């Protein structure tokens, strides 16, 4: 007769990831590459968001 023994699939080997273009460049160069840094009592906090 006929007998259903196993199941056939195709296991994948590679994975792909797609995301949209990286756009909103965070302010870092204005902090680490800044020309002037404030005194140690007028400390510079800059908010990055």
């Amino acid at each position: 007769g006929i007998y259903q023994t196993s199941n056939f699939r195709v296991q994948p080997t590679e994975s792909i990831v797609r995301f949209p273009n990286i756009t909103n460049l965070c302010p870092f160069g204005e902090v680490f590459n800044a020309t002037r840094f404030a005194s140690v009592y007028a400390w510079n906090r800059k908010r990055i968001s």
């Epitope: 002037r36 404030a38 005194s39 007028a42 510079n44």
Partner: nanobody, 115 residues
Amino acid sequence: QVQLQESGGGLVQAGGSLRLSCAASGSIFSPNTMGWFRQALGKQREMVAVISSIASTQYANFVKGRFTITRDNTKNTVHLQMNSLIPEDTAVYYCYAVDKSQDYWGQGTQVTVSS
């Protein structure tokens, strides 16, 4: 662009009087501190005086009881009364806004006293 205008120096004989002025424009958030600093050719910045938002006045021991700072709240300006001058005071001065962020210095006022 925070800009501070300096005025009121020049040539004065020994014993004369002058009135310097720094007027501040730009951001200059409310808790600011206006100071004045000395430099003669051959020396570094010598701290002369300081006024904060508290209106407290601070002066160095070099010129005890001779110079004064006046504070104008309406225009947020500063006037330094230079009285009882002595040729040891021959030095260009610069004023300094501590503020809360990037600091800004002056363009200079030539103060000369000799006989």
